[PDB]
């Protein structure tokens with residue numbers, strides 16, 4: 001049962017609803033084997049910080065995916081919302097994202113499409129991860145009708161240099177970008193193009209030596225960069241403490257293996273150190 005239009009999305013119209021009898025309030029997403037597999041998986045998954053797929057239904061010409069409804073996403077919190085202000089809140093979000101991600105990884109799944117608007121928050125400030133992209137998005141491809149800027153601003157360098165093999169590091173990089181967005185309140189690396197995006201990565205983070213990233217060059221789309229010295233994280237992130245700086249550190253290591261994993265991240269001082277995560281209805285909502 002329809003109840004409201006919520007927004008257009010890269011690859012879906014999204015509609016608030018109390019689903020046929022289903023009294024839970026719900027968001028339906030409107031748009032071939034692999035896609036069916038992805039649907040039944042996200043479905044089979046079960047984790048406090050992973051979005052709930054509740055049904056899919058549809059006859060070839062349309063698919064509709066049913067997720068429990070979320071107040072907002074982490075973008076609207078970052079975004080313009082100067083009402084909202086984030087300290088040590090930031091710890092909570094990361095705590096969740098990583099746990100959410102740790103689970104995903106443990107379950108041999110890369111969320112391949114993290115960005116602030118796929119880290120959703122429910123009424124009670126539980127952060128859940130959005131559908132791992134393809135689970136709609138590119139899975140079943142016909143694009144919506146939408147405006148709104150598009151966002152490759154979280155691609156790891158390995159994907160921008162067109163690695164046709166990737167892993168956890170892909171997600172961990174995006175998390176790094178999110179953690180940045182949070183602290184910076186602007187997009188950390190807002191590139192116009194993959195190439196521009198690689199520029200902003202390198203002039204911010206430094207150009208990686210072969211010592212830092214090995215195998216960096218034989219990357220399919222690799223093309224040579226001025227050798228930028230990069231800005232010391234503490235100069236990018238004044239707000240940041242050393243413990244957090246150390247997590248930003250690991251998430252942005254260039255070499256996808258050196259790059260921190262969601263578990264390893266989680267075990268870092270940041271998440272045990274003293275300004276603990278804000279309990280999360282203490283976690284601020286936008287209007």
Ligand SMILES: Nc1ncnc2c1ncn2[C@@H]1O[C@H](COP(=O)(O)OP(=O)(O)OP(=O)(O)O)[C@@H](O)[C@H]1O
Nearest residue numbers: 006007008009010011012014027067068069070137
């Ligand atoms: N589970 C949900 N609960 C509440 N609102 C949602 C939910 N999922 C999507 N939305 C809303 O849908 C709109 C666009 O979201 P969506 O996640 O579909 O964008 P996208 O990830 O770019 O595109 P898509 O997921 O369709 O490829 C936003 O207004 C957002 O508030």
